[PDB]
From Swiss-Prot, chains A, B:
<feature type="binding site">
    <location>
        <position position="129"/>
    </location>
    <ligand>
        <name>Ca(2+) 1</name>
    </ligand>
</feature>
<feature type="binding site">
    <location>
        <position position="164"/>
    </location>
    <ligand>
        <name>Ca(2+) 4</name>
    </ligand>
</feature>
<dbReference type="InterPro" id="IPR013530">
    <property type="entry name" value="PAD_C"/>
</dbReference>
<feature type="binding site">
    <location>
        <position position="381"/>
    </location>
    <ligand>
        <name>Ca(2+) 3</name>
    </ligand>
</feature>
<feature type="binding site">
    <location>
        <position position="154"/>
    </location>
    <ligand>
        <name>Ca(2+) 2</name>
    </ligand>
</feature>
<dbReference type="InterPro" id="IPR004303">
    <property type="entry name" value="PAD"/>
</dbReference>
<feature type="binding site">
    <location>
        <position position="404"/>
    </location>
    <ligand>
        <name>Ca(2+) 5</name>
    </ligand>
</feature>
<keyword id="KW-0479">Metal-binding</keyword>
<dbReference type="GO" id="GO:0000791">
    <property type="term" value="C:euchromatin"/>
</dbReference>
<dbReference type="Pfam" id="PF03068">
    <property type="entry name" value="PAD"/>
</dbReference>
<dbReference type="GO" id="GO:0005829">
    <property type="term" value="C:cytosol"/>
</dbReference>
<protein>
    <recommendedName>
        <fullName>Protein-arginine deiminase type-2</fullName>
        <ecNumber>3.5.3.15</ecNumber>
    </recommendedName>
</protein>
<keyword id="KW-0378">Hydrolase</keyword>
<dbReference type="GO" id="GO:1990830">
    <property type="term" value="P:cellular response to leukemia inhibitory factor"/>
</dbReference>
<dbReference type="GO" id="GO:0035578">
    <property type="term" value="C:azurophil granule lumen"/>
</dbReference>
<feature type="binding site">
    <location>
        <position position="156"/>
    </location>
    <ligand>
        <name>Ca(2+) 2</name>
    </ligand>
</feature>
<dbReference type="GO" id="GO:0004668">
    <property type="term" value="F:protein-arginine deiminase activity"/>
</dbReference>
Amino acid sequence: RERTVRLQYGSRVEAVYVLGTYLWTDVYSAAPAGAQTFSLKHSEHVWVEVVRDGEAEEVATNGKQRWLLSPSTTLRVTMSQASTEASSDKVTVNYYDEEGSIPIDQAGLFLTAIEISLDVDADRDGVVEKNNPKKASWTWGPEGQGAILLVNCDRETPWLPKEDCRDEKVYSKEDLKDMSQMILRTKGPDRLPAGYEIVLYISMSDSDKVGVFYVENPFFGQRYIHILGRRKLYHVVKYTGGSAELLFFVEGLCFPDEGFSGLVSIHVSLLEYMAQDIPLTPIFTDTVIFRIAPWIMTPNILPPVSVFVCCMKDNYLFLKEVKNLVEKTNCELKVCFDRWIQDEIEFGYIEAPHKGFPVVLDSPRDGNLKDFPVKELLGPDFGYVTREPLFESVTSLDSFGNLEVSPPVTVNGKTYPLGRILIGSSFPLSGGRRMTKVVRDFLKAQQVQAPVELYSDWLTVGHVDEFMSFVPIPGTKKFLLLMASTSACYKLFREKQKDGHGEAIMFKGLGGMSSKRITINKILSNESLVQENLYFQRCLDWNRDILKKELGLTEQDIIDLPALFKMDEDHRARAFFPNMVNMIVLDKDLGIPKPFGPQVEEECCLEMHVRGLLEPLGLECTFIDDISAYHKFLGEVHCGTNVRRKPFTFKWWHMVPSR
Amino acid sequence: RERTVRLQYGSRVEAVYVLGTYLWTDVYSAAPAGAQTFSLKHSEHVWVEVVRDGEAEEVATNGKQRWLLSPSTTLRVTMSQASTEASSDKVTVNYYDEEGSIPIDQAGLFLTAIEISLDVDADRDGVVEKNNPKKASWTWGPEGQGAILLVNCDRETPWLPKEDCRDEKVYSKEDLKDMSQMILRTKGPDRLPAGYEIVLYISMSDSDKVGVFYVENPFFGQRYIHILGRRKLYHVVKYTGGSAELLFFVEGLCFPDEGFSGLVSIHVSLLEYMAQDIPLTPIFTDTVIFRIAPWIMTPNILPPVSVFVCCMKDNYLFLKEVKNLVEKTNCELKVCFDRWIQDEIEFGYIEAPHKGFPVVLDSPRDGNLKDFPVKELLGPDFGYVTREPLFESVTSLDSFGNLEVSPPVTVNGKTYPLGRILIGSSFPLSGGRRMTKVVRDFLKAQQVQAPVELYSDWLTVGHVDEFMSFVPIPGTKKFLLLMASTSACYKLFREKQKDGHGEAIMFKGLGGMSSKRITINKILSNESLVQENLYFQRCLDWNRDILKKELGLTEQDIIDLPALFKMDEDHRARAFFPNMVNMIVLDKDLGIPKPFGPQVEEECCLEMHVRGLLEPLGLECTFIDDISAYHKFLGEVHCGTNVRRKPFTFKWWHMVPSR
Ligand SMILES: [Ca+2]
Ligand SMILES: [Ca+2]
Ligand SMILES: [Ca+2]
Ligand SMILES: [Ca+2]
Ligand SMILES: [Ca+2]
Ligand SMILES: [Ca+2]
Ligand SMILES: [Ca+2]
Ligand SMILES: [Ca+2]
Ligand SMILES: [Ca+2]
Ligand SMILES: [Ca+2]
């Protein structure tokens, strides 16, 4: 980095020299009129070259050499070490006229060299390296660089209702662990020369994306000073001499979103005071960039940590059977005394090289059913983020039973190491329901899960988790797509009828259904129901094809589970018997909603059929009864579950998302 | 592309097959309960494979072979050619039970194969190729692909005031030449089977970015039908049998900008009618993408075409001398009877493989000076674009004397083949003036000129063209940065004073300045003026350094022209004598504002000095007097010029801009 500094006619120039730059110095303008030649002296730690029309020559500290004065003959001045109090760093130029060897005048440049570097951990190893040359840019990939920042969206102490990043204050030092470190490293003499100051700053635009704190240790305890952030765009730094470091802590306030890429910048400048009423001149500027870490979703193949369950206190069978299931595993069971846990929240995570933690996305509230956000999960290293439609009204498709994510896949040679987010929608020309733009824009902005829209709008509730799920294949690295299938159910019922079981009864033991006496015969004979379910099978197959295309799946990767639906006035489907596809997946152990299918030899033929599909693959099935407490099934489920999982081993910043 | 089609239990399925896909076909669900095995027949142009648990085997048109019925034994069905009226394309499956070889039932699939492809010129050669496999994506670079669209911002006929793209109508067929072609190619029998239609569509979001027209040739003349665009999101296509093509013409309505990347999409779907009140099912969808071409600026090194000049009718010397200058060249001179031509307009261009033309950017109006846009240049193949601040108020920095562009440069190994846009600004912490966000966002969004902000706010008017310009070096591929320099002027004046010329007078022949009797002595003795100009030289040098850094320039690339300024109450500079740096550059021929400097031996010493710098490089200097008609110079110029240049040879789409 070359910087222009002119000797001044007749007088002397004093300048700060910042290490890592060099000066090109005009000696001609300061020369008296009529002067012919010049000579120079310089001090030990100042390197000086005479550059004549591009050709550079090193010059001794005290030589007698003379050069012709020319506008194209200049000096290049370099220093390799900071000034100390013992320094006198200078270059002096003497001018001579035609006759005589005694100087007729002199001009000089007195220098104070300092080091100024704003440093961050751009190599993503957790420690802050000295002046990474790539620190001012951010590149994706295994070879990529630039520093990473977490949205500090958890809450360190319960005494306040709001996530840590909602204010300009820091209370507990634990908060600092969520933050990225930025160090201003300087070296120099006891003080900066008169007329200089060092200033940290950010743009107005980034002022709502970050906050930056400095830790002071005064007499009565540690304190946290907010030096940049909301309503603070700059901070004048107190300079200390010798070799010094100022440690700062940086928090992100905002996730990537529509209109915000996730990149923010922080600057330090050495400023020179010119005079009153005139702006200070930036002499030197150093810049670091941060990318705010995206919100990432966990597919069913990732190790389970905690099973969150919501049901009424008296649904005993459900609780007993869920507890049993979870006891087969190392997961914690958490119970709250009823679909909200599945529909209103999605457990994601965020990760930076230094730190990571789970973060809840809270579903938008309509004002009818959900008038209030659920913030009660907000805690230490458990974060919160939400999006609220300003104009667009919320529908059932905004619920998070409509939000899922695939396992890692490769499609046409493109790798999606974090899987792909899946959300249900309607056909483009349909005028049907679609998840709100604000939420779709959010998921898209995270970029690393490259969302795909499926077709869920043929379902009354309209959730992808009504028709599909993923399960790992035990003892392998592979997984299966599970699809609800009405054709499988009809095939099975028709076989059992042929077998003499046509009078086999469904919903056995549900007292509220008994008067209906629904048998296999009654189902197979219902002609309109057959046509409705053929149509629903077309809707399922349309999704099957999208999933095969966008996830790179073949028929080998798919298992069909018998399902059956009834159609409403809108020509949308609701479950005829509980949807088995929407199941609790804890590795090889699967909690599957109990179907209450036709009994053949005192076993549910749906249960036996599902066991016959899954068990050969090493999957262990537990059927979970959530409906008996209600005595009947009308197509709605009254319980919900959500599994919080360990994050991917693969680091999101190693991905290379499409431009 | 695999697509799911199930045989239906007991009945027959009729389907359209779109070429380029293939069907996976479930034969198991349609089999009666109890059936054991199946066999199949198929027609000549239907290829059928039996796939058993992943293993595929080709099957003859009429064999007797039988396979076990299994959910994992399916068919894969392919066709390589479209159906005609002579086609009966079918697959028939027969089912058999345990005992006996006579079929107990059959299910069949009757097929109509058609070709549907939406085609664009994605290989950027100007002709529309058949089904480019990359047509659905857009990639930068010499190896890149995807189709390009012009904003159709010119005006074909004068009878309407507005640019062509402001409406939904097309009047003259000449308009079509500005448009990109998109062809829907189909092949098939006389009609689509019952229950199908083909539909073109766009998203609501793109509906204000494009319009799409179809040309009809009815009895009374050619007409232009607007089928997609504003308030039209879809169009049902009239299908014609045999091998057919529908030619469409696509126009862009909008340049890339903040919030619009420039990419738009157009879709065609084959839709299947399910029943009343139910949405149609997209069966097949094909997509093409367009990128709208950015607005690009031309640097001084590009060949001049037309010199636009604005001055009062009676400034005769100016007109005579500009005419003389232009006569040395092949350029057209266009005169309008006064800075607006330089300040209110920037001549850019747009280019697509098929077409290109110049486009004027019109400076934002404040409501004080400019209350009205200048649309009078809008014409055939001369386009118009403007940006209006909604909130932010316009300042002098919004004028286009503050908007320039560098010649092509390479910086730290990164190539900028189109050069870089340069706009003047203030220091970040200064609270000074800055070009409006809306215009800055626009230039940034064009992406291919990667704009750089310089520091212009030390100048009263605040324009980069007050202090710097570029000129080519004749007989080479290189160029020079020209910088105003106060130090050069003081050096020169001090030499002439030493030489005995201190009483040499400036502004000689300007009657309104005569009483001031400004001499070299008077200038050099003015102490406060010296200090002001030392400060202005610091402002110039700060820019010099930015330019060297961001353009990859060395001192070898720069020539300093003597300049001098006076300071106002705001501590901002205005020219003491006309700024010579802001000059008309027509290749080797340079119109330079006449400085009216001190006369030495009856020649202006500023003119002789400038000739001595430039002439050795093969540059020919003509000094142009725009001030004599005014009898005095107060720091304002009353004439303006703008040179319209040929576009770069390098195609913008061959660039690879940073992510
Ligand atoms: Ca590091
Ligand atoms: Ca806080
Ligand atoms: Ca925290
Ligand atoms: Ca924490
Ligand atoms: Ca979910
Ligand atoms: Ca082509
Ligand atoms: Ca039009
Ligand atoms: Ca046109
Ligand atoms: Ca035209
Ligand atoms: Ca301009």
